[PDB]
C-alpha cells in the first residue's frame, strides 16, 4: 500500500473564487459533509480548492478503496480546523491507486453556525 504525500497551499483571492463558484454546500450546525470524488484511470492527480464564508471549518481527505457523491480507508490529509474563510485552501494529491476520495467538511465542532462551503475538484 503506497501512499504519496499530498501537497497543500493557500491563495488570497477568495472573493473572486467564491464569485465564480456561485454562478455551494450548506454544512449543518453540527454535521459533516462528505464529498466522494472517485478517481480516474485517465487522471493521475486530485486537485482541490475550497473556501467558506465568515467561519472556518474542518477539512480532511481520506482514500476509500472502492470502484461524485455528496453526503451527510486510508488517510491523506487529517481533519483540522482551517481558516478557509480568510483564504482559499488548495491542495493536490497523487492517486495512490483506484478508488474514491473522501473530502471531509467537518462542522461537528460548531454548535450554532452552519457553514457555506464553496469548493472545486479538478482534472
Swiss-Prot record:
GO cellular component, one term: mitochondrion
GOLD domain ranges (all copies): 18-123
Keywords: Acetylation, Coiled coil, Golgi apparatus, Host-virus interaction, Lipid biosynthesis, Lipid metabolism, Membrane, Mitochondrion, Phosphoprotein, Steroid biosynthesis
Region (Membrane-binding) residue spans: 111-113
UniProt KW NADP keyword: no
GO molecular function, one term: protein kinase A regulatory subunit binding
Recorded superkingdom: Eukaryota
GO terms, biological process: steroid biosynthetic process
Known partners and oligomeric status: Homodimer. Interacts with the C-terminal cytoplasmic domain of giantin/GOLGB1. Interacts with PBR and PKA regulatory subunit RI-alpha. Does not interact with PKA regulatory subunit RI-beta nor PKA regulatory subunit RII-alpha. Interacts (via Q domain) with PI4KB (via N-terminus). Interacts (via Q domain) with TBC1D22A and TBC1D22B; interactions with PI4KB and with TBC1D22A and TBC1D22B are mutually exclusive. Interacts with C10ORF76 and RAB11B. (Microbial infection) Interacts (via GOLD domain) with 3A proteins from various picornaviruses, including poliovirus, enterovirus A71, enterovirus D68, hepatitis A virus, human parechovirus 1, poliovirus, Human rhinovirus-14 (Hrv-14), coysackievirus B2, coysackievirus B3, coysackievirus B5, Aichi virus and human klassevirus. Interacts (via GOLD domain) with Aichi virus protein 3A; this interaction allows the formation of a 3A/ACBD3/PI4KB complex in order to synthesize PI4P at the viral RNA replication sites. Interacts with Aichi virus protein 2B. Interacts with Aichi virus protein 2C.
Name the UniProt record assigns to this protein: Golgi resident protein GCP60
Name of the gene encoding the protein in the UniProt record: ACBD3
Amino acid at each position: 500500500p503506497v501512499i504519496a504525500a499530498p501537497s497543500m497551499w493557500t491563495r488570497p483571492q477568495i472573493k473572486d473564487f467564491k464569485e465564480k463558484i456561485q454562478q455551494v454546500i450548506t454544512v449543518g450546525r453540527g454535521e459533516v459533509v462528505t464529498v466522494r470524488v472517485p478517481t480516474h484511470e485517465e487522471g493521475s492527480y486530485l486537485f482541490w480548492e475550497f473556501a467558506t464564508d465568515n467561519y472556518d471549518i474542518g477539512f480532511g481527505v481520506y482514500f476509500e478503496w472502492t470502484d461524485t457523491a455528496v453526503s451527510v480507508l486510508d488517510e491523506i490529509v487529517p481533519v483540522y480546523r482551517r481558516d478557509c474563510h480568510e483564504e482559499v485552501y488548495a491542495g493536490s494529491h497523487q492517486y495512490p491507486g483506484r478508488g474514491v476520495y473522501l473530502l471531509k467538511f467537518d462542522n461537528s465542532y460548531s454548535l450554532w453556525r452552519s457553514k457555506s462551503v464553496y469548493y472545486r475538484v479538478y482534472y
